Amino acid sequence: MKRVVITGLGIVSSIGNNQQEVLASLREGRSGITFSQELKDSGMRSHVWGNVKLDTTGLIDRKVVRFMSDASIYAFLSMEQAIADAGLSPEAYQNNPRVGLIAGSGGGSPRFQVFGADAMRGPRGLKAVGPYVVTKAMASGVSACLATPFKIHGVNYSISSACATSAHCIGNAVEQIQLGKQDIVFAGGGEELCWEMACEFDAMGALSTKYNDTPEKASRTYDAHRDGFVIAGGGGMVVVEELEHALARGAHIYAEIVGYGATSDGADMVAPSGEGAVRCMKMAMHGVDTPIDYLNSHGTSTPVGDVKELAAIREVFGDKSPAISATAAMTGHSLGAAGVQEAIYSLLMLEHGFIAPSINIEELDEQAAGLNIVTETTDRELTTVMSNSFGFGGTNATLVMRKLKD
Amino acid sequence: MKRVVITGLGIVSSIGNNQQEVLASLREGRSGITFSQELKDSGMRSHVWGNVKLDTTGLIDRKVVRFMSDASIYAFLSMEQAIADAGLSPEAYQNNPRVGLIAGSGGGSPRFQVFGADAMRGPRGLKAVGPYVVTKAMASGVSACLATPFKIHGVNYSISSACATSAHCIGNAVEQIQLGKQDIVFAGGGEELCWEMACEFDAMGALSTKYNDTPEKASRTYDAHRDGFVIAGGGGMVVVEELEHALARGAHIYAEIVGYGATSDGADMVAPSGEGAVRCMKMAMHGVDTPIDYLNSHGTSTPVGDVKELAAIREVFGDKSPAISATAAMTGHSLGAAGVQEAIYSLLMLEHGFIAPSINIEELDEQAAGLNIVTETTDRELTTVMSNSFGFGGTNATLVMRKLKD
Ligand SMILES: *C(=O)CCCCCCCCCCC
Ligand SMILES: *C(=O)CCCCCCCCCCC
Ligand SMILES: [N+]
Ligand SMILES: [N+]
């Protein structure tokens, strides 16, 4: 079939507003977690989050941004970055049936959905709601709000799968190219950050609550004292392109997507079975004749999740386990945007030959012994990398990226 | 080059709780629209909707339904029907890596999102929210809540694209089979019905408001006096299966999916360009050398939308325009669930050899002159049918289904 590569990337995360700032953070093992007065004031127990430190005011045309929620905004900015980074101009990607977009979010826009209901219940009713809430709150917001202004004519929809959302978007973009339907597909996603959505995770005891006094230490994947993930927001976009098309235009190729796994646990609603992850990674590794040098785990810093994934990793690789680090210990978990942002962190590590450190591991978990968990920025010539993304509903996604021969 | 067929269906709509009840409604041109005190009490101008006339209490295991919102419930029930209709036993589709599920909703669950925020702001805070709001409100709720209890091991995620959602879910399912990755994929979707979501549409003037005293006449696609669509809820699911696999087990085949189109307008955020729909239908018709005997239009009864689609149809078929009817005039528009429900209506028409009437046309719009809009139930031996689905963000989907030879 057709080979697929990544020729551009864009990102807005808790550790950087572009790939340069992100690279700097990854290398330094810098945390993007800060104290949130908003979460505290809402009555939550978790008072920390991975927020985007950027004033998006006036960065998007007024007539365009009026239909957008934060998830769409973060993704839109990420896409602008990706387009430039890919060296693409309007004449090449706009009004072109061979160019599409697949990007989504985990929950659309809880903030505007609540805004809509709150306004409607007010004395002005419909007049207070306004005519822009639907595009801001609908689940497809991220794809709709980008495909329209960027004049995309190809495929256009969002894939949603909880914390695996943007990982499946990328995988599906790869499939569109392998099917020969598209030459280029912008893939990724975004997720807003707000108490409206965060309080639901706190309500199920999934968020960290014992480290509010020391925010940068809250997310501590694999640490024996971890107590839940740190919610984060942001966006990310990658330019997925057919190999010949990319070579023909002299594009800059970060890596080739040589593996994509998507499976289902068919077990628990909010807990991983591990069995699904094993099949997902094996699927992504099928046909890959090179060993996995680095593995960017899902590792959101949860008691069960963290170790369940490691057990799955041991089952897949056995004794030949790759180097592992959970970037979430620095950035927090951006839910729907986690898949693309982590794929990007992995691509930056591959591009710059280094392994980001898995921070805040003061006491390694016993069930994490016998594995190579990197806790310090390590320079190394990586060739093949793997990134895992798991979401509620037993949904699993795995991406394997490899450098292209010279 | 795998061929794909539909071997089972399930549905919960405003016009029936199973395929038999729906068949009867379609043949009788019976409206599923009723007056809604809920919408009126909320302060809306639109007081009509296509509600599901069924008490779902106790129809799903307590431990399972606790994680579900209405969209998931409708889809779940639809899937139970589809499984039985397809004649699939547990050991045939469960714990099987070759069996997946792709289903979504247009907006997850506005009701539970608002519920969570409301509860959180109350005197009980987190305790009032409970630990089940995330799985109910997340955009992937429909796929997550079904893949888990049905023991799905293959693909598992939701495709979301506003009012084209379930149509893209079906198309993606076809793609998974064509890629040889799955032998069976349950595809479809669901959408809850509530003022929390409906008021947002009324706020942009998209819903009918001039026929509240005569509910069954509110949805009137192609009528010169149409004034917006009638919001509806419900679910639908179809069993997408590889041909050889279906034949081998002696499955009942409704039709083969011979065409699937998915395009983007790249124009207006909440209005169709028409140009995108032309490309979508043409894409779905590629290689289809049989004429379209019946076209189930998106036709949601909107001023601009109704005629824009007819213009696109004229451009695609020219002087060879097919018989057309908008089932939405009877059922209302179920948003994310519309795609699969309309594909099911089309399959029932194909299976039973008849064309459902496009009701409530008291005065045909002038821009619809010269077309074959069926306004009376008409028996006819159909062979190839087409169904269109369009959504905000300029997202387009078209499905073409054809009876298998003998
Ligand atoms: C990751 O799998 C955990 C679940 C994330 C679901 C997406 C975010 C849902 C927000 C709306 C519900 C609060
Ligand atoms: C169809 O294209 C019109 C848009 C449908 C969106 C359905 C989901 C909306 C959820 C958010 C409402 C404020
Ligand atoms: N990851
Ligand atoms: N349709």
mmCIF file of C-alpha atoms in Angstrom, chain B residues 24 35 44 72 77 132 143 148 190 229 271 289 296 328 370 396:
data_model
loop_
_atom_site.group_PDB
_atom_site.id
_atom_site.type_symbol
_atom_site.label_atom_id
_atom_site.label_comp_id
_atom_site.label_asym_id
_atom_site.label_seq_id
_atom_site.Cartn_x
_atom_site.Cartn_y
_atom_site.Cartn_z
ATOM 1 C CA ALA B 24 -45.445 0.557 9.334
ATOM 2 C CA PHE B 35 -45.812 18.745 21.314
ATOM 3 C CA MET B 44 -37.964 28.058 23.711
ATOM 4 C CA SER B 72 -25.782 5.456 24.585
ATOM 5 C CA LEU B 77 -30.913 -1.047 22.429
ATOM 6 C CA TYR B 132 -20.600 8.447 36.437
ATOM 7 C CA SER B 143 -18.926 3.814 21.415
ATOM 8 C CA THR B 148 -17.422 -2.535 26.797
ATOM 9 C CA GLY B 190 -27.445 7.856 19.115
ATOM 10 C CA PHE B 229 -36.095 21.585 11.332
ATOM 11 C CA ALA B 271 -24.810 26.747 5.947
ATOM 12 C CA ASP B 289 -23.046 1.646 -12.819
ATOM 13 C CA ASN B 296 -33.310 9.650 0.879
ATOM 14 C CA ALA B 328 -37.346 13.898 8.149
ATOM 15 C CA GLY B 370 -38.961 19.473 -12.303
ATOM 16 C CA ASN B 396 -20.713 15.810 3.971
#
